[PDB]
Design an enzyme around this catalytic site. Structure first.
Site, mmCIF file in Angstrom:
data_model
loop_
_atom_site.group_PDB
_atom_site.id
_atom_site.type_symbol
_atom_site.label_atom_id
_atom_site.label_comp_id
_atom_site.label_asym_id
_atom_site.label_seq_id
_atom_site.Cartn_x
_atom_site.Cartn_y
_atom_site.Cartn_z
ATOM 1 N N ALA B 37 0.767 -1.139 -0.300
ATOM 2 C CA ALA B 37 -0.176 0.070 0.113
ATOM 3 C C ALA B 37 0.885 1.303 -0.138
ATOM 4 O O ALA B 37 1.811 1.244 0.626
ATOM 5 C CB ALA B 37 -0.862 0.166 1.128
ATOM 6 N N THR B 38 0.431 2.324 -0.729
ATOM 7 C CA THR B 38 1.003 3.504 -0.717
ATOM 8 C C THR B 38 1.212 4.083 0.938
ATOM 9 O O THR B 38 2.307 4.657 0.930
ATOM 10 C CB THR B 38 0.419 4.508 -1.517
ATOM 11 O OG1 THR B 38 -0.189 4.092 -2.683
ATOM 12 C CG2 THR B 38 1.038 5.960 -1.470
ATOM 13 N N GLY B 39 0.301 3.939 1.770
ATOM 14 C CA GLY B 39 0.514 4.428 3.099
ATOM 15 C C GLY B 39 1.841 3.671 3.636
ATOM 16 O O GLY B 39 2.453 4.181 4.503
ATOM 17 N N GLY B 43 5.462 5.220 5.066
ATOM 18 C CA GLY B 43 6.043 4.833 6.364
ATOM 19 C C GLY B 43 7.353 4.456 5.962
ATOM 20 O O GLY B 43 8.304 4.577 7.006
ATOM 21 N N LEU B 44 7.685 3.451 5.026
ATOM 22 C CA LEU B 44 9.084 2.944 4.899
ATOM 23 C C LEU B 44 9.870 4.145 4.440
ATOM 24 O O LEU B 44 11.123 4.036 4.649
ATOM 25 C CB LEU B 44 8.862 1.817 3.757
ATOM 26 C CG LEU B 44 10.310 1.282 3.493
ATOM 27 C CD1 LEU B 44 10.283 0.158 4.539
ATOM 28 C CD2 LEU B 44 10.101 0.180 2.293
ATOM 29 N N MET B 45 9.269 5.154 3.785
ATOM 30 C CA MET B 45 10.373 6.258 3.285
ATOM 31 C C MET B 45 10.732 7.112 4.447
ATOM 32 O O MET B 45 11.921 7.318 4.600
ATOM 33 C CB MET B 45 9.585 7.000 2.097
ATOM 34 C CG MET B 45 9.616 6.250 0.889
ATOM 35 S SD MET B 45 8.622 7.257 -0.303
ATOM 36 C CE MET B 45 8.973 6.771 -1.750
ATOM 37 N N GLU B 46 9.841 7.159 5.424
ATOM 38 C CA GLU B 46 10.046 7.922 6.805
ATOM 39 C C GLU B 46 10.881 7.052 7.448
ATOM 40 O O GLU B 46 11.792 7.677 7.869
ATOM 41 C CB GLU B 46 8.818 8.214 7.535
ATOM 42 C CG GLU B 46 7.527 9.002 7.008
ATOM 43 C CD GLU B 46 6.849 9.227 8.094
ATOM 44 O OE1 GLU B 46 7.367 10.099 8.915
ATOM 45 O OE2 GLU B 46 5.470 9.071 7.842
ATOM 46 N N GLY B 65 7.419 13.634 10.164
ATOM 47 C CA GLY B 65 7.301 13.742 9.013
ATOM 48 C C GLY B 65 6.288 15.015 8.783
ATOM 49 O O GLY B 65 5.303 14.947 9.078
ATOM 50 N N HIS B 72 3.469 6.751 -7.198
ATOM 51 C CA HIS B 72 3.640 5.439 -6.697
ATOM 52 C C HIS B 72 3.241 4.676 -8.199
ATOM 53 O O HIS B 72 1.953 4.661 -8.520
ATOM 54 C CB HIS B 72 2.541 5.071 -5.716
ATOM 55 C CG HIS B 72 2.747 3.639 -5.018
ATOM 56 N ND1 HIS B 72 3.806 2.712 -5.252
ATOM 57 C CD2 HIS B 72 2.250 3.245 -3.996
ATOM 58 C CE1 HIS B 72 3.515 1.735 -4.656
ATOM 59 N NE2 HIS B 72 2.800 1.974 -3.670
ATOM 60 N N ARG B 116 10.894 16.524 7.198
ATOM 61 C CA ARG B 116 11.004 16.062 8.411
ATOM 62 C C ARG B 116 11.140 17.546 9.487
ATOM 63 O O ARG B 116 11.799 18.396 8.963
ATOM 64 C CB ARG B 116 11.948 15.083 9.031
ATOM 65 C CG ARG B 116 11.542 13.865 8.037
ATOM 66 C CD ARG B 116 12.191 12.615 8.508
ATOM 67 N NE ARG B 116 11.697 11.974 9.840
ATOM 68 C CZ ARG B 116 10.608 11.549 10.023
ATOM 69 N NH1 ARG B 116 9.731 11.285 9.062
ATOM 70 N NH2 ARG B 116 10.172 11.062 11.015
#
Lengths: 133, 133
Positions: B37-39, B43-46, B65, B72, B116
């Site tokens: 999922a894009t969400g 979170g993985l990018m954060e 963030g 995507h 951030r």
């Protein structure tokens, strides 16, 4: 569903939508303050847009989120209601775009844009299978 | 921190990071294709940028963030490794800005920008706890 039409979606944040619940695998997130995670705000904004566009799909179709571009401007602990407002900006063929914004009853928490593409579910799942280990 | 320094974060996508798992309470999401999922990508990018920043924070600090703006562009089933590349663009006071991208070993899956803000964890947690119903 005309351009400029607004669709609203309300969600009381439960304890399991905080940062540590997005990635329980992340020791780096484990002890973070208990606030609604950006990735969950994104998924709530996308959910609002999917509910807004459901009348546009034909049988056999679904949709993917193709871009998200938002700010996250205030923090929300569990218990507050996040209202997302999805304002349709463009519909053209397979491509749809909204302005999304979210408020927790106390503060505006973030806003921006979201784009979706209509897909054929069976064709898409076959492509997914071919890159599945 | 060094502007232009690239950090990589690799993550094998497990079955519980598909769209249905982001919001188990969404009937809409329950029928979606079993893709990352894009969400969860947000979170993985954060998480990548949090790991990059950690050595440079003072004791008792963390970060939030404040914006994400990403495409995507390809879908990823469980079992592939998603590698996030995070590159620092600027540091201004408490604000850090990043270029982020991610690839799943087969396709580039998304790219864009992320910001951030450094926080004092205890001070911020105490302020959060005060808007809690």
């Amino acid at each position: 569903m005309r351009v400029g039409e607004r669709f609203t979606h309300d969600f009381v944040v439960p304890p399991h939508k905080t940062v540590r619940h997005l990635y329980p695998e992340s020791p780096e997130f484990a002890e973070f303050p208990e606030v609604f995670a950006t990735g969950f705000m994104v998924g709530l904004m996308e959910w609002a847009c999917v509910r807004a566009m459901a009348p546009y799909l034909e049988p056999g179709e679904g949709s993917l989120g193709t871009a998200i571009c938002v700010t996250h401007t205030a923090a929300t602990p569990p218990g507050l209601t996040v209202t997302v407002t999805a304002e349709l900006r463009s519909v053209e063929g397979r491509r749809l775009s909204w302005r999304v914004s979210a408020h927790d009853g106390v503060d505006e928490i973030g806003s921006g844009t979201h784009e979706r593409a209509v897909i054929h579910l069976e064709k898409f799942n076959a492509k997914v299978r071919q890159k599945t280990p």
